[PDB]
């Protein structure tokens, strides 16, 4: 639901 | 409302030791990653170091490795930083700063809402 | 670590103006996957916290004025505050949240010009 994806 | 509030800070001599603390209200406190940003006299924002909300991972900018630790008590709703071998440089007001979505991987990797009002740290002899 | 900077470092500009403060970062960050811009814009008052004011570079945070606004991608951003007020002489940051450890812009700080 957190939309605050690691962009690695 | 989410409420966020800084306490500890002082007059500290070169080399000493103080420890912060930030009181939050307002949120299941577990469920977000915490942060310390500082800001020294008249410059601009640095963050310090972060905690997952479970307190199982800590992160440290390499200004500060070595010399301050990052904690929180989930039974208190209380997060922690204790700073050791304080040097002038670290002179500067310390807020504490939440993720606004969640428990965002690294702790720390987040935009930060809300802050607290911040506790000031003056390191001098 | 990537290296956000602002631009200009001040300006005065008069109420019921626009101004408009640009903020670059060293290298993109826009996500693909998700194409999310990780970036965000804070005002800061005198003797205050920062605040939040724009996240995803142009999603303007609940309760902030819709006279603010961000825009951009990548590398380029920028935020614009329309028709301008009497308090919001302030400090602007930008920050990107792509990478860590998370580094902020230096600040610009907005005169209001009388």
């Known amino acids: 639901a957190n939309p605050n994806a690691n962009p690695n | 409302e989410v409420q966020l509030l800084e306490s500890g800070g002082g007059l500290v001599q070169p080399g000493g030791s103080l420890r912060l603390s930030c009181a939050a209200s307002?949120?299941?406190?577990?469920?977000?990653?915490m942060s310390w940003v500082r800001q020294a006299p008249g410059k601009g924002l640095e963050w310090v170091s972060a905690?997952?909300?479970?307190?199982?991972?800590?992160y440290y900018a390499d200004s500060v490795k070595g010399r301050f630790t990052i904690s929180r008590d989930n039974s208190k709703n209380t997060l922690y930083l204790q700073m050791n071998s304080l040097r002038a440089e670290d002179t500067a007001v310390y807020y504490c700063a939440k993720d606004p979505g969640g428990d965002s991987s690294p702790a720390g990797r987040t935009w930060f809402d809300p802050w607290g009002q911040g506790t000031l740290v003056t390191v001098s002899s | 670590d990537i290296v956000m900077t602002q631009s200009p470092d001040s300006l005065a500009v008069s109420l019921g103006e626009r101004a408009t403060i640009n903020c670059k970062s060293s290298?993109?960050?826009?996500?693909?996957?998700?194409?999310?811009?990780?970036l965000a814009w804070y005002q800061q008052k005198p003797g205050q916290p920062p605040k939040l004011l724009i996240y995803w570079a142009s999603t303007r945070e609940s309760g902030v004025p819709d006279r603010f606004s961000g825009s951009g991608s990548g590398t380029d951003f920028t935020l614009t505050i329309s028709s301008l007020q009497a308090e919001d002489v302030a400090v602007y940051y930008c920050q990107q949240y792509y990478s860590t450890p998370i580094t902020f812009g230096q600040g610009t700080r907005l005169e209001i010009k009388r």
């Open positions: 307002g949120f299941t406190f577990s469920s977000y990653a």
């Open positions: 290298q993109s960050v826009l996500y693909s996957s998700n194409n999310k811009n990780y």
């Open positions: 905690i997952s909300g479970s307190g199982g991972s800590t």
